[PDB]
Design a protein around this nucleic acid. Sequence first.
RNA 1: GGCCAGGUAGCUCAGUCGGUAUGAGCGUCCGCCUGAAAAGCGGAAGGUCGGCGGUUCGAUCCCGCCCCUGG
Length: 46
Amino acid sequence: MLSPTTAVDAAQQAIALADTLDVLARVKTEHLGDRSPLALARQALA
RNA sequence: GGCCAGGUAGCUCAGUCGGUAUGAGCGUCCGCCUGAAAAGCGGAAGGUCGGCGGUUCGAUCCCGCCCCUGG
Ligand SMILES: [Mg+2]
C-alpha cells in the first residue's frame, strides 16, 4: 500500500475545509503526525 | 578558553549509530461514574529530541561550528 497519492489529496482537502485554528490542529492530527496514514507509510519504509 | 558528561513532552527523567521516541511517571482532555468531584477502568491530545549548517529518497542517531550546566 505505497503506490499512489490519495493520502495527500485527503490531507489537502481537509486542510482546505478547516474553518478555525482548532479544526486545523485536529486536521494536523488526522492527516499528519504519528498516527496519520501518511506517516504510517513512512513507518512502513522499514 | 581547554577538556568533557549532558540539553529529549507541561514537570522529573529513561531510551535510540537512518523510515515507531510503541517513551515512562506525574501534568492536560474525553467517556463510564458523581448532585458536582476524585480515585478506578477505558480512550485520546501534546515533542520542530539544544541552535545553525553538512550527507542521503529520508537524520534526535554520522560530520563541522556554536549557544549553557556539571566541568
Ligand atoms: Mg476524568
